[PDB]
Design a binder for this molecule. Structure first.
Ligand SMILES: *Cc1c(COP(=O)(O)O)cnc(C)c1O
Length: 383
């Protein structure tokens, strides 16, 4: 029956331990986290540049409501395509060096929309084994064939691409990977993709706004232009939403065949104004100051772990894995940190293999050096 199907599934998830439970917060973005009315240093949010609380972005969101009301009133294909949406798209395309940008209500929707629209049963997706679930889920449901290459292994990628394919091939990777914060070798990946006549799709959720000139992200920094670039605004941008960057004809195509685009309500124009505001901060001298402050905090953090009984990742970004090893020690550590006013998130098997449990820390430009020093002190020992 249905209920038994439900029940058994929750039971298998329990047995694998794997149970998830949301905790409500009064504040969850930026330097602080407030839970159960207690203040904590927040090392668990994706607000990498501290923009969620930025007064210019807050005011754009507020004035945009005065000017446009709240809901757009419809899809972008009927009465919901605002002059603010259009301006935001044009400013994103110009920023990142593409012909067109298309807005989406979430990065998860944009990824899923692109793949559903572009990939046919004859085609192949070659995706990094560690790609975001939205990408892999979508690639899996797709009628097209899905092959994974070992993480960042371009030799393995070239072999996948070289295998006979009845249709077209799309390579997919991240500019900065979600789990370990490492970067993909985009220039070599792009070379072998072109060698096999494929196209490249890069998801730069963790790179966008945070690295490269004017924060343009991983592709710009590495002087690669993939055919498809997906940027999401729920992280560094400090808001929510996403864009697909692409050529004129691919944009026209998505406008015809991406159903998330055709049959979904567009975002509130006041959300779009906050995103334009966010983009303007990111591109500005203050954007540069925030990125350099983030880099300074990361340096301070990685230096201080050198004396600690833990290990770091190959990450130069806001994502800073602290590898602990054992799942009980990792859980203990995070619980001790919490008692001591530092809110962290532990990642343990099975999400990661056997003996690699960890805290996945995230730093932000809203933090201060004394916050890193407090984290380091508690990691050391004191309470
Ligand atoms: C967060 C995440 C997204 C999902 O974007 P949302 O706007 O949060 O839906 C896509 N890709 C990567 C690599 C991400 O980490």
């Amino acid at each position: 029956s249905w209920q038994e199907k439900i029940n058994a599934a929750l039971d298998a998830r329990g047995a694998a331990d794997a149970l998830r439970r949301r905790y409500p917060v009064a504040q969850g973005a930026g330097r602080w986290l407030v839970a159960d009315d207690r203040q904590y240093l927040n090392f668990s949010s994706n607000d990498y540049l501290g923009l969620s609380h930025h007064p210019q972005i807050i005011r754009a969101w507020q004035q945009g409501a005065e000017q446009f009301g709240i809901g757009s009133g419809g899809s972008g294909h009927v009465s919901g395509y605002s002059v603010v949406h259009q301006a935001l798209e044009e400013e994103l395309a110009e920023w990142l060096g593409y012909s067109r940008a298309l807005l989406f209500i979430s990065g998860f929707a944009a990824n899923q929309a692109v793949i559903a629209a572009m990939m046919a049963k004859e085609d192949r997706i070659a995706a990094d084994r560690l790609s975001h679930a939205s990408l892999l889920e979508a690639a899996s449901l797709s009628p097209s064939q899905l092959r994974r290459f070992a993480h960042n292994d371009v030799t393995h990628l070239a072999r996948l691409l070289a295998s006979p394919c009845p249709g077209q091939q799309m390579v997919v990777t991240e500019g900065v990977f979600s789990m370990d914060g490492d970067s993909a070798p985009l220039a070599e990946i792009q070379q072998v993709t072109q060698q096999h006549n494929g196209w490249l799709m890069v998801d730069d959720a963790h790179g966008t706004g945070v690295i490269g000139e004017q924060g343009r992200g991983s592709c710009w920094l590495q002087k690669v232009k993939p055919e498809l670039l997906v940027v999401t605004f729920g992280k560094g941008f400090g808001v929510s939403g996403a864009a697909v960057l692409c050529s004129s004809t691919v944009a026209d195509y998505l406008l015809q065949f991406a159903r998330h685009l055709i049959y979904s309500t567009s975002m509130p124009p006041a959300q779009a104004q906050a995103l334009r505001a966010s983009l303007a901060v990111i591109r500005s001298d203050e954007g540069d100051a925030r990125r350099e402050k983030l880099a300074a905090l990361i340096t301070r953090f990685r230096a201080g772990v050198q004396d600690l009984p833990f290990t770091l990742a190959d990450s130069c970004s806001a994502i800073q894995p602290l590898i602990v090893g054992d799942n009980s020690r990792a859980l203990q550590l995070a619980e001790k940190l919490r008692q001591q006013g530092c809110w962290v998130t532990g990642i343990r098997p099975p999400t990661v293999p056997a003996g690699i449990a960890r805290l996945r820390l995230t730093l932000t430009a809203a933090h201060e050096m004394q916050d890193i020093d407090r984290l380091l002190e508690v990691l050391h020992g004191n309470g």
